[PDB]
Design a protein around this ligand. Structure first.
Ligand SMILES: CN1[C@@H]2CC[C@H]1C[C@@H](OC(=O)[C@H](CO)c1ccccc1)C2
Ligand SMILES: O=C(O)CNC(=O)C(=O)O
Ligand code: NA
Ligand code: NI
Ligand SMILES: [Sr+2]
Length: 300
């Protein structure tokens, strides 16, 4: 029950109530009957299976200056293969690119092999964004904000991170606003902070896992939780997951949503530049919320 599964074809008010409770209590939930075509979800996963099976000489096309990219600024939207962290038996290869707006220069950075990549992944990205914006509107209703509150610079960046985890038999907040993750194998765990317990997020191949980022934790003034989650390498399979990470542009200023502040809900963060946060978030792993620690105020 600590990972709620929310049916998006229930009554609207029940959806709002269930999403709001999940956001307050956990910061992570799954959605089913969510309106994204299952056929397209299957096709996207098949595209990534094909992509990660390509020979090394194809992979080199995504290695800037001959080596994988790192998650560091500037974080370009053009498609690259990234590595992140070290684990010994890379433990994670990620193909990442922006998706929105889909400028010609951005699209022409995407893979051309496998040949269906651009058609499938463009359609997938449009559908996942539409679902994300629906979820953000349910969140607006739960917070008491007008519909469309997040339909601006706060959602300007849509990074697709397709992750490949080589098998081996022997945690973070996402820094952005909100993430949708498609998975088909065990490996994702969520931290239940109140119980200091890591628990599995059941793989439902036709669902999306929704997790709130550190930006939404700040903007909600901690009325919502951000999700701290981690991945366990599979002992048998090479696991692939598909994340759509939506959030602000690098030129944005972030602060607790001003309309929700009150005498009993004073701001817990001062305004900060997203780019400055992003540098710390990507560099400083000393604590899960290191990226926002410099901006905390009104602590008691
Ligand atoms: C597992 N890691 C974590 C989460 C995904 C992956 C890569 C990195 O996160 C990002 O690169 C995202 C891209 O939007 C980001 C970058 C700067 C600011 C806010 C968010 C850290
Ligand atoms: O791959 C997964 O199951 C989870 N991925 C992430 O949390 C991430 O890339 O930020
Ligand atoms: Na393997
Ligand atoms: Ni994550
Ligand atoms: Sr539909």
């Amino acid at each position: 029950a600590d990972v709620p599964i929310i049916d998006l074809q229930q009554d609207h008010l029940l959806i709002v109530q269930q999403i709001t409770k999940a956001c307050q209590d956990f910061g992570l939930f799954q959605v089913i009957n969510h309106g994204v075509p299952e056929k397209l979800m299957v096709e996207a996963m098949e595209v990534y299976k094909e992509f990660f099976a390509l020979p090394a000489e194809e992979k080199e096309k995504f290695q800037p200056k001959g080596e994988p990219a790192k998650f560091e600024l500037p974080l370009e939207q053009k498609a690259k293969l990234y590595v992140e962290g070290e684990r010994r038996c890379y433990w994670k290869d990620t193909l990442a690119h922006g998706c929105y707006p889909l400028h010609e220069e951005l699209l022409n950075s995407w893979p051309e092999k496998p040949p269906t990549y651009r058609d499938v992944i463009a359609k997938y990205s449009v559908e996942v964004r539409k679902l994300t914006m629906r979820i953000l509107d349910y969140i607006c209703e739960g917070l008491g904000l007008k519909l469309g509150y997040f339909d601006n610079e706060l959602t300007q960046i849509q990074m697709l991170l397709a992750n490949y985890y080589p098998s081996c038999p022997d945690g973070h907040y996402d820094g952005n606003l909100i993430t949708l993750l498609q998975q088909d194998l065990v490996g994702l765990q969520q931290l239940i902070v109140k119980d200091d317990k890591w628990i599995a997020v059941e793989p439902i191949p036709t669902a999306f896992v929704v997790n709130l980022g550190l930006t939404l934790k700040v903007m909600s003034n901690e009325k919502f939780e951000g999700s701290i989650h981690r991945v366990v390498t599979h002992p048998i399979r090479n696991r692939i997951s598909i994340g759509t990470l939506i959030g602000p542009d690098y030129s944005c200023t972030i602060e607790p949503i001003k309309e929700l502040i009150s005498q009993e809900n004073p701001p817990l963060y001062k305004p900060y530049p997203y780019a400055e946060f992003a540098e710390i978030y990507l560099s400083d792993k000393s604590d899960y919320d290191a990226g926002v620690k410099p901006y905390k105020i009104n602590q008691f």
